[PDB]
Amino acid sequence: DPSGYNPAKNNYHPVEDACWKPGQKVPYLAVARTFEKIEEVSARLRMVETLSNLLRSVVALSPPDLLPVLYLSLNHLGPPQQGLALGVGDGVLLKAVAQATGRQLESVRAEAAEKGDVGLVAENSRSTQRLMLPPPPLTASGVFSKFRDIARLTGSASTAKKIDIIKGLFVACRHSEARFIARSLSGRLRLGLAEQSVLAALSQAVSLTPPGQEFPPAMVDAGKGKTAEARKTWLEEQGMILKQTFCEVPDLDRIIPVLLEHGLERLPEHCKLSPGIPLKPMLAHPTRGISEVLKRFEEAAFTCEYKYDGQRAQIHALEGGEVKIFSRNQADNTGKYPDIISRIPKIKLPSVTSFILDTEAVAWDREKKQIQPFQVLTTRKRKEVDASEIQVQVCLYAFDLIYLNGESLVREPLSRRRQLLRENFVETEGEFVFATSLDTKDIEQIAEFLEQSVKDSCEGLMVKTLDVDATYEIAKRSHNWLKLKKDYLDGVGDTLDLVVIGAYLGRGKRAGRYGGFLLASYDEDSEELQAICKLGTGFSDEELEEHHQSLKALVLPSPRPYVRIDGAVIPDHWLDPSAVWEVKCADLSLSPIYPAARGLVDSDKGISLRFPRFIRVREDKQPEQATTSAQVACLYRKQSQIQNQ
DNA sequence: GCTGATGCGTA
DNA sequence: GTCGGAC
DNA sequence: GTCCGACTACGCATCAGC
């Protein structure tokens, strides 16, 4: 019986310890039980062991069910470049849960906010899970198809249809299934296992129990002969095949059926980095100072690049002339930028037959010949733009080359790839230029360069080694670059003193306390606190608890007459304005929602904070003594990017 | 058809 | 996007 | 250090209720 299933069981046996006969379909309750054991523990190694154990049975008995099981555990709907989204929000999901169970909405919405988890509410209600005799059990592939069903429906009257499908599952759910369907739909599975741990579990699972094996499979534990040391080394090198493959083709739709009929050793042969197929980009680790750079890099030579404030654009040029473009999430952004396809001609030498570029698309005002802020870039249409429409021009700032003229430049040092980029590509000012770089190790030069980038409408510096551990092999270390941001540096930075005027109930890791707060500045001339932004990162678990107790004393039934939030999300608890917190941010923005300082820099819009974080309590300060909307308008005006307008 | 609410992808 | 926790 | 999951602003695209 599946409810008995224990994929966490000591010395776990794929065929004997399963809960479905071979060539049957994997049952969803198996997937739910594997989930229960994964969330029950906190070590990633144990989690990987359990998910491996389920994945091995799935390979021995129902291999067609492997792809959907993996998707179910990532909570993905498919390849990222295909663009699926469920289009179901918390409120619809709560209507779905309520109807399915027979309960009043208000009651359901209440308990969900209270427990901080919709899955818990969907589980523990089972009326009409009475009158109608139980529907057939739920299958892993079936649930994953109903998910793809929901995400597929669009247009007028689709919500009602999306709900019916969800009610379908909730009625077929038994045991712990409703908990995880509800969690998945809400995009909050919170197992404590995600992409990296799935890959680990996959490669271990096919390593221990390889596919394409005549049932009953000859070998079910290819690890038994080896000693405990020899095992761990073999596991690690197996996982790295998969990881670097996935990193070049993060697409289970391609990778998986290839694994099922060619084994893991042969995967790099059939799935290699290739234009038109987006690959995981290289990521930056935050570095809190020039001193920490030399700690992290020690003896390796490195370069310093301008960090541009636009959005990543991974430009693909295939042999045959076709041109595609992808976001850092692997989204297809090709239709987004007609203007960039037209200008592919202008950027390469005639000898260049195919490339993958790593660049930053940055809004550009040609009238004035300089960079506009991020808020401008985002006003451009998405979807399917036709070139006549384009309002906000973008300029490309290239800083890496991944694949040239048929050959894959991944294993090559940066020093190499930057040369190749500089050789075969052509700067056209205000349209496609290279990243301002300074090769150096002198701390004074590095600091002057930092202050210079910010002067030139940028966020600070990127930092990349040139030859030591300086490839593009994301699977070795994904966060292989450093970001030296201006606001990372103690003493340097916009910090504001803000008043807590509201609290929001936490979810998940924050259930039972407050997960975020509403913050305001003081406006002297209208004798009013005005909401500036929400705050939800920067406190320790202890600090966040102290805040729950100290601020519960001050919960108010309704807001003070002098509190002004306008468009912002109404808090769950209004608070007596007393508490003053020190708050740091990266930028200040013109807000469509917040009333802080409205009319002082824009007749219509107020000012907000970009990337706000809690620093500490201002025990010595009073709401009167808070940063003032006047000061918020001063801070905004002096912003480097802003003075250049 | 108009309007307000909101999902979601970008940072 | 930034940030803290468990390992 | 690595991986994971709490949380932030903003604006285009979408749909329900009228």
3-state secondary structure A39-84: HHCCCHHHHHHHHHHHHHHHHHHCHHHHHHHHHHHHCCCCCHHHCC
CA A307 to each of CA A293, A356, A397, A449, A463: distance values in angstroms, whole numbers, following the listed order: 16, 20, 10, 11, 9
Q: What strand order describes the sheet that includes A284-286?
A: A284-286, A481-485, A460-465, A302-306, A437-439
Residues A275, A324: Cα–Cα separation, whole Å = 8
Closest CA to A555 of A580, A528, A534, A575: A575
User: Pairing mode, if any, of strands A613-617 and A432-434?
Assistant: unpaired
Q: Residue A443 in 3-state DSSP?
A: helix
CB A530 within 8 A of CB A606: yes
Residues A115, A123: Cα–Cα separation, whole Å = 12
Residues A573, A579, A584, A589: is their CA dihedral positive or negative?
positive
CA A444 to each of CA A449, A451, A487: distance values in angstroms, whole numbers, following the listed order: 9, 11, 19
How many C-beta atoms lie closer than 10 Å to residue A278's C-beta? 27
DSSP A447: H
Q: In the numeric block, which tokens belong to residue A503?
A: 């609290």
Does residue A546 approach strand C to less than 7 Å at its CB?
A: no
A365 strand-pairing partners: A370
CB A23 within 8 A of CB A60: no
Q: In the numeric block, which tokens belong to residue A364?
A: 């550009």
Closest CA to A87 of A35, A165, A15, A20: A165
Residues A216, A421: Cα–Cα separation, whole Å = 53
CA dihedral A574, A576, A579, A581 (to 10 degrees): 30
Stated in angstroms to one decimal place, the resolution of this structure is: 2.9
Residue nearest to nucleotide C5 (CA to C1'): A541
CB A577 within 8 A of CB A560: yes
Is A307 annotated in the active site?
yes
- Name the experimental technique: X-ray
How many C-beta atoms lie closer than 10 Å to residue A173's C-beta? 26
Kindly give, in sequence order, each residue whose CB lies less than 8 Å from that of residue A462, ignoring residues fewer than 6 positions away. Answer: A284, A304, A305, A306, A307, A399, A435, A481, A482, A483, A484
Residues 571-630 of chain A: which lie with beta carbon within 7 Å of strand C?
584, 586, 611, 613
Q: Describe the crossing of helices A140-152 and A28-40 by its angle, rounded to 10 degrees.
A: 90
**Strand B protein footprint, C-beta under 7 A:** A 83, 85-92, 187, 309-312, 327-329, 331, 333, 374, 378, 611
CB A521 within 8 A of CB A629: yes
How many C-beta atoms lie closer than 10 Å to residue A625's C-beta? 13
How many C-beta atoms lie closer than 10 Å to residue A376's C-beta? 18
Does residue A328 approach strand C to less than 7 Å at its CB?
A: yes
CA A328 to each of CA A278, A311, A385, A395, A453: distance values in angstroms, whole numbers, following the listed order: 9, 8, 20, 17, 23
CB A49 within 8 A of CB A223: no
Residues A45, A51, A55, A61: is their CA dihedral positive or negative?
positive
Kindly give, in sequence order, each residue whose CB lies less than 8 Å from that of residue A208, ignoring residues fewer than 6 positions away. Answer: A52, A56, A220, A221, A222, A223
User: Pairing mode, if any, of strands A495-505 and A284-286?
Assistant: unpaired
CA A594 to each of CA A12, A534, A591: distance values in angstroms, whole numbers, following the listed order: 56, 10, 6
Find and list the nucleotides of strand C having atoms within 7 Å of a protein beta carbon. 1-7
Q: Half-sphere exposure of A282 toward its Cβ, with a 13 Å CA cutoff? A: 24
- Looking at residue A251, its amino acid is D
Element (H, E) at A311: strand A311-317
CA A288 to each of CA A486, A527, A543: distance values in angstroms, whole numbers, following the listed order: 9, 39, 22
Residues A203, A243: Cα–Cα separation, whole Å = 9
Residues A116, A515: Cα–Cα separation, whole Å = 10
Mark residue A504 as left, alpha or beta (left: phi above 0; alpha: psi -120 to 50; beta: remaining): beta
DSSP A334: G
- CA→C1' distance for A135 and D1 (Å): 48
Residues A469, A477: Cα–Cα separation, whole Å = 9
What ranges make up the beta strands (E) of A524-623? 528-535, 555-556, 563-564, 573-575, 580-584, 587-591, 606-610, 613-617
- Report helix, strand and coil shares of chain A as percent, to nearest 5: 40, 20, 40
How many C-beta atoms lie closer than 10 Å to residue A470's C-beta? 21
Q: Residue A512 in 3-state DSSP?
A: coil
CA A326 to each of CA A82, A204, A330, A359: distance values in angstroms, whole numbers, following the listed order: 11, 31, 5, 11
Residues A16, A4: Cα–Cα separation, whole Å = 13
Q: Which runs of consecutive H residues, i.e. helices, occur in A414-518? A: 414-424, 443-455
Closest CA to A471 of A291, A278, A248, A242: A248
Please report, in range form, the residues annotated as the binding site of A for Mg(2+).
360, 459
Kindly give, in sequence order, each residue whose CB lies less than 8 Å from that of residue A585, ignoring residues fewer than 6 positions away. Answer: A487, A494, A495, A496, A533, A609, A610, A611, A612, A613
Q: In the numeric block, which tokens belong to residue A30?
A: 């198996």
Residues A565, A593: Cα–Cα separation, whole Å = 9
Q: In the numeric block, which tokens belong to residue A24?
A: 């049957």
Residue nearest to nucleotide C6 (CA to C1'): A42
Cα A443 from chain centre: 34
Residues A358, A421: Cα–Cα separation, whole Å = 10
Find and list the nucleotides of strand D having atoms within 7 Å of a protein beta carbon. 1-16
Check A307, A324, A348, A486 and give the catalytic one.
A307
Query: Phi and psi of A522, rounded to 5°?
Result: -95, 130
Cα A50 from chain centre: 25
CB A268 within 8 A of CB A306: no
Please report, in range form, the residues annotated as the binding site of A.
305, 312, 360, 459, 464, 483
Q: In the numeric block, which tokens belong to residue A220?
A: 């079910």
End-to-end CA gap in chain A? 69
How many C-beta atoms lie closer than 10 Å to residue A463's C-beta? 23
Query: Residues for chain A: how many in total?
Result: 645
CA A517 to each of CA A268, A491, A530: distance values in angstroms, whole numbers, following the listed order: 48, 25, 14
Does residue A533 approach strand D to less than 7 Å at its CB?
A: yes
